[PDB]
Symmetry: C3
């Protein structure tokens, strides 16, 4: 109705909440890039996206990468790979390009040289979204000599811009 | 207020947001079951449930189980044990019975055989809800030889169905 | 119409208050540990995000002293909140109930000035009382140590609306 404003909407002939606001599902098939202490690699991932109320959730699957540093960045390039009609701008946080420490959590990453991984307890958080790239910080928990990393499934969530 | 549709509701004579939508508390007294690589066991938990906006949160307490595999499933049976007037259908995700990797997190589980536990950081996620049973994947982090598992308190959350 | 927050006038129609959807603040305050006769405090500068019916407290990494196998981490919201946020704004929707909310893994580095050993502890929101939020931190075993390296931790819970 012309006298209602999204997320408020006509719901079977009355005043309700837009179903689209309550739950929207999408997908990202795209590139995750790691950078830290001169180490750089990238990997393609298939990830569900769920937008629920004023939050976005990016459900990353387990993946394998190469060497990581004590501290580093994991970057999700949303500039391509989003399933239409979801656009890059739809992934911008409500704090826009502010630098933050949002949703900080433990992530166990298995470091190896081909053999039995040693799992390190690292600290991950959403740090910054900039020009359609979501940057996550991954640091702490110490490290070992390794050439491969086994990354767990990780859900990345934050407040979405409206 | 025939013109209104939940979660929009009459609030002190005007148009507001239903308090029931904003916060609801409940309880599940029920059975958590583990299955992985031919290992099966179950325990009872008494767990708070919070429904807040379009999310449901299941606050599992710490519990003790037996042997686990490198990878396996932890299943919560919502068919029984929900506090009235909550029903089994109330726990269906907004992605219904789709197979997902939602709310993936680290859980540290203490593995022992009567002595001091070794804590394994494993990877847990909501995988699938089917006919009132919520299936959580628990994998990764390696393992040791063990007969007993000490599970931490874990909160499991996901967007909740509304039609 | 007679609108009731968070329903509010938006651009001439009935919509959702932007304030309900996203609010960003800060808490510059004192975090106190207590367990088994151990007591210490630190200063934190932390972002607060209020999004829909949730509050998120984004604690930065900090260093403290000895911890017990089980103990309490307490956030003093009586002071330090950035105006116009007030202490009452941090009350959970379960008010002063004792709960086990948002239980998660937290890896904490225990040392005596040398290389930390990281212990996977279990943290949850336990109770808010008179402007003090009590978090429980237990499990994962322990070692003899004089210092603790705490990771960045985000603490979230449903927020009271009165
Ligand atoms: Mg106590």
């Amino acid at each position: 109705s012309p006298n209602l404003r999204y997320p408020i909407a006509d719901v079977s002939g009355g005043i309700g909440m837009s179903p689209n606001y309550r739950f929207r599902q999408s997908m990202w098939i795209g590139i995750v890039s790691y950078s830290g202490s001169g180490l750089n690699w990238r990997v393609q991932v298939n990830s569900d996206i769920f937008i629920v109320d004023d939050y976005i959730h990016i459900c990353l699957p387990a993946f394998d990468g190469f060497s990581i540093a004590d501290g580093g960045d994991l970057s999700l390039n949303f500039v391509t790979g989003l399933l239409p009609p979801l656009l890059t701008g739809d992934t911008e946080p409500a704090f826009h390009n502010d630098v933050v420490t949002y949703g900080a959590q433990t992530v166990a990453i298995g470091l190896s040289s081909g053999g039995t991984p040693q799992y390190m307890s690292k600290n991950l958080w959403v740090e910054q979204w900039q020009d359609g790239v979501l940057r996550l910080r991954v640091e702490g928990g110490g490290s070992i000599t390794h050439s491969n990393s086994k990354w767990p499934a990780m859900t990345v969530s934050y407040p979405r811009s409206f």
